Amino acid sequence: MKILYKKILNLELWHDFYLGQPNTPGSLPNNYDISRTLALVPTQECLRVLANLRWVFRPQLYGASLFANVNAAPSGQFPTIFPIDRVYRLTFWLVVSDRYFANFTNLSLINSRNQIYYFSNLSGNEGHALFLT
Amino acid sequence: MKILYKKILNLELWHDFYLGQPNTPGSLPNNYDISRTLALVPTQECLRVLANLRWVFRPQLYGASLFANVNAAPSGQFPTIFPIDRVYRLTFWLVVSDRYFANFTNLSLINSRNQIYYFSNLSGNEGHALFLTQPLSAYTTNNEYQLGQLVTHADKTLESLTYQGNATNIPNPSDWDSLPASQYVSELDHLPRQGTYRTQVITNANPDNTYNFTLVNTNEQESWAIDVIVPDTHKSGEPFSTSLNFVGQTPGHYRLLENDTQVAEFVLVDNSLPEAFALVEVILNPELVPSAFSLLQASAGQTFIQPKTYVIRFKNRATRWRYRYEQPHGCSAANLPSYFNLIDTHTYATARPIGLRQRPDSLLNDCQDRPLPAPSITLIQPETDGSQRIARIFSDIYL
Amino acid sequence: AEYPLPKFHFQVDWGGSRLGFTEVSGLDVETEVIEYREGNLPQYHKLKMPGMQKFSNITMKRGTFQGDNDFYKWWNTVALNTIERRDLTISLLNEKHEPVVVWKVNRAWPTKVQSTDLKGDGNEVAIESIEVAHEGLTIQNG
Amino acid sequence: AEYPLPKFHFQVDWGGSRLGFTEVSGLDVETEVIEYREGNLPQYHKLKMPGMQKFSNITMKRGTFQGDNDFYKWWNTVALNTIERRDLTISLLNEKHEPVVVWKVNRAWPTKVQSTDLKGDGNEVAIESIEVAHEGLTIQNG
Amino acid sequence: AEYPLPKFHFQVDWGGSRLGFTEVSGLDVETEVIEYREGNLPQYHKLKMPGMQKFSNITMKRGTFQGDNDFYKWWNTVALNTIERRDLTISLLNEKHEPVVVWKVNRAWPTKVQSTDLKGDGNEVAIESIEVAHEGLTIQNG
Amino acid sequence: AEYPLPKFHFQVDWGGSRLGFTEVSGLDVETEVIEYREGNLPQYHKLKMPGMQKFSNITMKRGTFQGDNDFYKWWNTVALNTIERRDLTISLLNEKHEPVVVWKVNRAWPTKVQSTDLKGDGNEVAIESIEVAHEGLTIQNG
Amino acid sequence: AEYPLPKFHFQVDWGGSRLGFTEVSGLDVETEVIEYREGNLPQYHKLKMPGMQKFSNITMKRGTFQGDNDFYKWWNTVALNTIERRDLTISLLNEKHEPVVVWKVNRAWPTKVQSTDLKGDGNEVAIESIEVAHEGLTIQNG
Amino acid sequence: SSVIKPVLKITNEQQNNLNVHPTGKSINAIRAFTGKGTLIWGARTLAGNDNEWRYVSVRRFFNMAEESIKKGSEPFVFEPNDANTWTKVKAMIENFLTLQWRAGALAGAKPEQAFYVKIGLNETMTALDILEGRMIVEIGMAVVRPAEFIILKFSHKMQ
């Protein structure tokens, strides 16, 4: 039983409290880390859908990653074990670990306890990166 | 009750990781020891057969030994308590104790998990010892040798340093090294191992016929047989698969035949000791083992013992040493040891492979004249080719 | 966040007037083991599964001051089988005095009060102790 | 291979987030003795034969860090008689960090968790402990 | 022959691969007392006579080496009520390595095996112990 | 040999799914005595001879599992004077998971079923019992 | 599965307000045996067949509260030979607060009520008991 | 349950050809027996001449076991390919197989005779496999097989 896995997604989270303003953004430094400030958590539906699709979730020092189960073709292209040709939807909670977070993060100081943030891949904004904002 | 015992067999195991290359092989040194790297283990059949023959097994610091129970004659000849005049077969597992063994032993790096090694006293090869390996092939012209092959030529033994799709009339000195004349282990001893159940395929399956399969061991005795009947709705000419069961046989070397034709040859295994490394077989048969290898003489209605010493030998691996740095080193192509090659400002490597030893005699000097540490045996880095062939093997030293 | 914590900077909310306790011990939780084996099991030792829970009493020690009679005050509110129960909070603080580890106790009433002993040759401060029973405990870290 | 080993370089796989334990004790195995004698035996002491097996609980101690609440997390997964069981691995390492001796535990769930005590005069780190029950143990050396 | 002997140079034959034990204790023999008195005896204390014999378990301690798993090997040969029994020999040697005092044990099988404990601050060697039961003991001196 | 067997590795064939019990007792056989004496016999005590046979009821105890209602199932197959009778086999097993001593019980039907008792403070498993009547018993050893 | 159930989490429907008891015992069923033998049977012991059924009384114990006089209330509804009969349900609960084993008791009325005893030196709670007769019982598992 | 009768009656002589055939394709029957109802009679696969995959229960059990092993050894993806991970993986597999043995699924007097697990450099792997990133594990298991035929022999007792 041969099982081949390949990375299929990169999710990164940046904060100028650590990075500052580089004169031209590239990649993060080699010592970047937010593993104690922010965390990504799959929901239950996300878990069972990843199970059905045979994909694997993994936390990282900069965010998370997804691994797909593929077949090794000669062309160099990697097909999935079966054609994923329907519509699918994956959701994740973003949780904060560091207290005083709302003090160094440039957020709105207006009283909002009935609102929540939201990020997606339906936002265009493809400049020097793929921005989920 | 007087009981007399005499040594009747010497089994030795050599490794160049400890010995090196002597200019002419004799005996081992007085401080030789592999008691923590390799071990010989008798099987169950071997145990009960040694019991019936009244022989005694004993481990040693270099291998093992066998002791026979004999009668003291005046002539100086030593006869066994009874005439051993039938055919007998003794088997032993060879097990490895030292991890990282596959790194300093010059073995084939190609993925083989369905094969096992095999050694016997039916291999001839009586040169300066009694070698239980197969005789090494000769250096020819226009053949294909992989990196690591050992051959024989002009009273010497040649090692391969790179891949050659077509050979030369005379050895190219930049592709071969020059060692003394001796035999070693090679890919000529890598037989496929098998368990209890087999899937055998008949080509051109003909419903109008039958087939009788047989199993033949080293003593040329039939040990097993069944029949298979192809049904009469099978379109003539297609392959046909069948299942075979060898549940009641003792592990060893066998040839599988179908109707007076060799179809396969393999070492049969019962997984009594699944992690065994190799198998050793020793035979008592006055017809199959030559006189240079036999251990019993027959005369005057009796048998007399002849002590012998059999040898197996392993050669060490050879890698290219690569020194890597954290901060830049200030040495240049104009001030470094001639045997080096500057790769970049943080790296330089040897130009020819060096052999892995435990107490490497002399170490290399730096351009500033300083001894450098030798590599470790925990990691090796083979690099594959465009055609997915092995091209080079390094050892990295981080300074 | 990267260093291990020390054990000498803490505080206790116990519905009492003053603060400044010396020793606080007794913070444990446990579950009982139940064992089982049937005759035909190939192993010759037993199987284990969880049972009921158990909690310990908590002990606190502090020094004696003029005008402060709070341990006795709380203990003395006892009628036949009725008493005044309180919620207890214990917190461990770090260098910047931020609560890091919190123990929450449920329904705690004082079962024992011990006063100091008097020695004509004792060069030490007078210390008093209280022992408390409760019906629950919960740990919160981070 | 020729030297005796020390006892201060080890690691524990316990399905927990962090590592770095201080003390690990409790690794034992035992069998009970059964005795027998009949009246006409010329010796006046008994014969002995093996019986049932017995295994001990395992104790582990570690230091306390901000944000780490894993012992409590594992202990608190207990329903009436159900709990989350894990496979435990303990390994002793040598100078070159190679696993030499391995202890494999089977079906282990936490039976007890003890937190630190608080002293106004204590110049020491805070340490916590866990006690674990299991249904098997196996030793592998070489 | 005229000097008293020391207690630090000895050896043990136990059918095991290696040698070099640190501690060996438990070498004892005993007999029970039976007491009796009838009403008209002029002395008002009892008479005593010998009864049954009793033997103790033997404990041995040694240091841990890479590749040596012999205590476990012997302990693990146990079926329901069958096990591999061995003859044990212990000898005390003098300056010229000549056996002087010999203890012969009869039918000994291992009842207990204890491994070392792990301490992050322990500057000592790792030691293991075995406990053995037997059905006889005999002393030979000179 | 010289060692006898233990009492904790057995199995029961009774017609139900599970094959593991915690207790099996009641395996006996008996014959009555008849006495006789005539007036002129020189001894003044009686002569004795065999009479009729008697067998006992058998009791079995096991632990309670979700989904298993077999004792009740067998008991509840009772009409006016008809019931489902079964052949019962009890065997005492050895190391090779085989049988050494076999008890064969003829024409068995359940006469009594007892369920567990419920205690708010009971830290034990729930156990149930069955009591069975039969018309014969036979022992086979070796 | 492989683990059985505990005995301390249950509930009782009996027609009164409170639903928590400390003890419930008496859940049994039985059938008598009838024996028969004729003179010419080659075996010298009897044949056995089923007879009539028998059920037991049920006992329940609980603690005493101010304002609750329910045992007496039910007992005191008795006229000459008429009384108020109720259907009784007993269930053994699981982690999800559901029922696994159910006992259904048919036509129950209280035959006995016992109050606590008074001790000037008794450090215990006051407990009361009721004993109930019925005309049927049924077990449901899974 | 909820069955009256099968539509056809099968005899033993027909069952002989349904159950065993030179082509290996086998047909399991459903037959009525006096007083017992209608019962399933036969438990073979379509590969009835295969010494390993003759029976349904063996194949289904193997499927279950390998699925559980896959799920157990998934979390180690993108972990260091060294001895420590190999130790952990072997421990997980052996604990699962021990639990399966003690319930009566596997044959053997101890867990040493019921199964074996091989993972390592000197067992199933080489340096090339370390560089590639591949892990190879070999697992052997002995399962219990049923009894299909019961033969009774009768005689007149000597007297």
Residue numbers in the entry:
A (entry chain AB): 1 to 133
B (entry chain FB): 1 to 399
C (entry chain BD), D (entry chain AD), E (entry chain FD), F (entry chain AE), G (entry chain BE): 2 to 143
H (entry chain AC): 324 to 482
Sentences copied from the publication:
Contractile injection systems (CISs) are a diverse, yet evolutionarily related, group of assemblies that mediate bacterial cell–cell interactions. Their contractile apparatus is homologous to contractile phage tails, using a contractile outer sheath to propel an effector-loaded tube into target cells. Here, we characterized a CIS in the multicellular cyanobacterium Anabaena, with features distinct from extracellular CISs and T6SSs. In contrast to cytoplasmic free-floating eCISs and cytoplasmic membrane-anchored T6SSs, Anabaena CISs are anchored to the TM, which is mediated by modified tail fibres and a baseplate component.
The resulting maps of the baseplate and of the distal end cap reached resolutions of ~2.9 and ~2.8 Å, respectively. The distal end of the CIS was capped by a tail terminator complex. In contrast to previously studied CISs, the cap of the Anabaena CIS was composed of two proteins, Cis16A and Cis16B, forming a C6-symmetrical complex that terminated the inner tube and sheath, respectively. The structure of the sheath–tube was highly conserved to related CISs and was composed of 23 hexameric layers of the sheath protein Cis2 and 22 hexameric rings of the inner tube protein Cis1. Further details regarding this spike plug and the bipartite cap in a related system are discussed in an accompanying study.
